[PDB]
Every structure is written in structure tokens, then in C-alpha cells.
Amino acid sequence: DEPRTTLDIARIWGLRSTFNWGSGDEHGKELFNTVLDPGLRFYDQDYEGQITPMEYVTGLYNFWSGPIELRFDFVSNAFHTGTVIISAEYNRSSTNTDECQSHSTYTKTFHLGEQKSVHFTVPYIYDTVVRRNTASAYLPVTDYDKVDNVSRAQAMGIRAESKMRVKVRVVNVLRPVASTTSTIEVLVYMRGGKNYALHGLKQSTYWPSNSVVPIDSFPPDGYDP
Amino acid sequence: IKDILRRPVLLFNHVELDPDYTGFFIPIMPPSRMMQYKSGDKETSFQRLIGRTPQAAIMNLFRFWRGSLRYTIIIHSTDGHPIYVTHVPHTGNRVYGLMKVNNLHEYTKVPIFGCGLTTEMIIPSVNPSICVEVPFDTENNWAVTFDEDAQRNYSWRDKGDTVTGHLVVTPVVSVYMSVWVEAGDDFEVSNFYGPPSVKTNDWNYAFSDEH
Amino acid sequence: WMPINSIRVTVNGKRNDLLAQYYIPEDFLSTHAKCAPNTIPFETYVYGKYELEMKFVANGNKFQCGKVIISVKFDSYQADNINTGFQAALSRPHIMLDLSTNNEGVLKIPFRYHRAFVRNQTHKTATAGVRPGKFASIYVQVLSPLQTGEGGANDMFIRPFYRYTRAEFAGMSYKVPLT
């Protein structure tokens, strides 16, 4: 049952994000919206938290390819009812208020009711056979050095930022009974597809941020109390 | 996983060997969060980039490991002096760097390499580099990869279970060395722990494709 | 089957919060269900190998909702405070409890330890070099907080039950009180 390859670890489901869906949310409203890049979660800010297994492992490689799977678990009961539409968008992105632009792409409409979960394979449609990682191959900065344009100019590579997105919009407004909660949380999982690939070993993007202590000489280094 | 772990990881970058000591100790354990640098902590002989290697990232997920490790040691010299690399089995301690064993001030008459333990010599004039394979000479079934706190003073027998022994380098005269480490052919990992809490700031030190 | 202490899940409980945790077998001997007949062989024998099965039974009403996760960490001594999140739990062998539906979940726990046997009991004469009675850790964690309706219950309860599928004992000795 133990994973043999890096691709086996990428096939483990991991919680990316969470979003709320309420009865106040009008039709065509973006409940969820993100750039699907397993290289970096953000291009414009620091990340700190529990990254998904497929993102963690993709951080070790310079290249990735293949479909990415998603799973939307709705933390609800039987009395909650509504409809959403998941949409994989390519090349160009849609306006936040324009639902019709999202509907034109590769979509799956989910009728929430008794079933409180939906799977979604995101097709890999790019100009290249593989995508290079947005993160760096080698980063010698260890002590949070204040960056300048000269430092950026002398970087390892140039970040090819992805414009490909997945969005979740309201089709039918959530109409739960008065007895139950009006708003529900939706857990967004991700993993690599069955034909997910990785290549080009490099410096890891992610590194432990909690309870990091270097080893000392036991017992010479003041272990005898 | 095994293919990744069998490539070499650089541990020590140009570290001094001093003949006043017994030798430079290397604890037999793979690269992991145990050897990770944190900005602010005390300066060690270890390199800062061990934590961010592919293998270290893999070994953070598995808390058990069994089998042999392979150590590539390079002596920065072209002299005819022999530099000895002695293997110590699992005794129960965990040390690194230069150490005077039993705090003596003379070790040429009582060398560790001429005590009885398994030893191999490097002759830099012939070859300054060597690759030595250390066995799994321990009482335990598995060797523990990491702990939550490496510097915590807990039960002393359990404290030493993170290593399977030591590798001690002893020179004739003062000379520097560099050390790599990798997994052997006979090597396994187990006890999958899953991914820990992590941080990154790679975005900040690079331009986008739109200038 | 032997029941252990009740677990209270409230609306105040956030994601990643430990509802309960168990260092096994220690906590099933000398804290939870101390008068159980399951604990009788541990009094006399010093060593053993242990494969467990843990059932969880939740009871929240239909107008409530939430998610709880229970996972196992093998050989967790001095590694309980790392790889101890909801994400690490989802990776390791686990079960998921929906608090509205009240689905049951069963954790099959094998013996995965760095030694041959685990020590059963500490003693005054016994060594302090090896910390006994711990080959694994169980964690009960909030995946999604509990929510309720207008004028509804602000909490609901979960009850764990344990049993040894394969408990082999070794090294007979004089009987002692457990911890």
C-alpha cells in the first residue's frame, strides 16, 4: 500500500482550498476562481500552510504534464438544494460578471441534493506537450533578503505564468429549508490524473515551516544537565 | 523513490580535518529536515541547502529506513599521506564534526582506525576521492529518519536510534574535505507520514513573462 | 469491542483542532476503560505485538452538518507535533465521519514498529532508557466545523470502540498494576 514512485504520491487526494455557498449568492456569481498551476499557488504573494501532495511532489520537478483531477465535497445535508457549474477555461479568461463566457468552455453542471460530492477531470490542453515549472530551479536566498530588480534580473529563469483557470458559478440559487443553515462550506480537493507526469529533478519549492531545529552533538553539546 | 535517493547529496563543503582530534565524525543517516537550516539559528558545519534537496523532501515523508548508505569523500590534497575512514556500528550516540574521544590530547599513538574496527584509506596522490558503503549494523529493525525536535533531551537510548553508526575521517596533517551521501542498492524506506506544513518565497526572486 | 471515553464536537471547534488523541496501547490500559478484561494479559506479559480495529459512531441531527477525520500514525514517539495536520491525516490510513448522516467508520491498524516487540508496562526496577507502551498514535480532528440551525443544538457526540484483531504476548512475569 506504500507509494513506490512520486506519481503514486501525486495520485493522493489533497485539500487545496475552501469556499462558502449561501442563499444570498445570485446566479452567475463566482463561488470559486483560481489559476490551475501545480508549480505555484500564488504568483504575487507568499504561501504558508498544508500544501496538497501533488503540489508538494511537483515542486521537486522542473516539468509537469497530463490531466489534473478535482473533487468538490459540499458540507451539507439532504435539505440543502441548488445547482453549480464547474468550468475549465483555456488561453483567455472570463469576466467575473459574465457567466456566458465560462459556459462556452469545458463545463460540468452538478445538481446538489442527496449526493453531496462531484468529481471533475480537467483536460490538459496547451501549446506544448509539457509545461515548465513557474518556481525557480535554484534559489540561494536563505535569510529573506530584501529583493531588488538586479536580483530578479540575475534569476535562474523567467516565470511563464499560466492563464488557465477553473471556476465554479451559481446556476440555481441555493434554497435550503428554514430549519437548516443558509450557508454551506465546499471543500476543493486535487490530485494528478492517471496520466500525470513529472520530469527534471531540481531544488524543492516547498520546505518545512514548523518545528525546524538542526542537529547537535549528543551528548557533548550540553545534554548532561 | 529509490532512483531519486541513490543520487548524491552534498553535506559538508570544504570542512577542516585536524590531527589533534580523533577524527571528523559523520552520523550514518540520510538527508532530511534534521539537517535543515533556519534563518537565525546557530551556524553549523552542515550546508544550508540540504533541506531543499529532492531526497530530503522525500525522506521527510518516510520516518523508517533500512539498508546501506554510500558516502563520497573528497580530500583537498595531492599528498602521499594516508587519510583513514573508519566505520563505527550503532553504539547509541549521535555526534558530528571534530571530537576528542574521552577528552584526550593525543591520538597518533591510539588511532581509531587501528583499534580493530573496519577501516579504508584514501591516498590523495593516487586518488583524492573515494566511495564507501556503510552496513546496517544496528539492533533495531528500522532506523528512525527524523524527530519533531532534534535538540530535545529525551530518553538516551531512543535518542540514538536515528543513526545506525558513524563514519570517522582521520588525517596525518591538517587538510580539508568535502562529503556527499546517497542510498545504497540494498536500501528501503517505509512508514509514510504524508506531507508536512511548508512555506515558499520563490515567486519574489523572479520576473514574470510580461516583464 | 470495548468503548472508550466520549468525544464532544461543538460549533466553536475549528478545522485542524484535535478533538481527542490516543497513544496506544498505553492509553487503553491506564486511562481509557481501565477495568476492561482486554487489559488483563498486559499485567503479566512484558512484550507483545498488537493489531487493532477501532469503530467510531457519531450521533448528530439532520439539521446539523460537518466533517471529522480520524487517522493513525505508526511509531509516533517524539514525532506527534510534526505531520499532524488534516492533510497528513488524509494521506495516512484514515476514516471520514459526516456528522449529519451518521455513517460509521472502521480503522484497521497493523503493527508497524522499529523494534520486534513493544514494551507493555513501565516499572521501578525496569529501565527508563526505553519509553514503553507506545507503538502508534490515533488522532481525531475536525475537517469541517460543526454547524446547526436556528435555536439548534450547539454540540453532538462521537463514541470510539476498540478491539485487538491480533494481540500476541511474550515474556511472562509477575502481575503488576497498569501504570
Binding site: - | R152, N153 | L18
Partner: peptide, 26 residues
Amino acid sequence: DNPHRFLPANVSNRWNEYSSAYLPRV
């Protein structure tokens, strides 16, 4: 001295590890 050596009394048990009762460690 080194603060990693010994845990504070409120969070830890007799053995100098995080107590099972102390849930807030996470």
C-alpha cells in the same frame, strides 16, 4: 539556557513530552 531541552510544566507530562490532555499544541 537552551529552551528545547525541557518543556514547560503546563503543556507536558512527567516524561518531558507533550501531554495527551494538552490539545492546543496544534
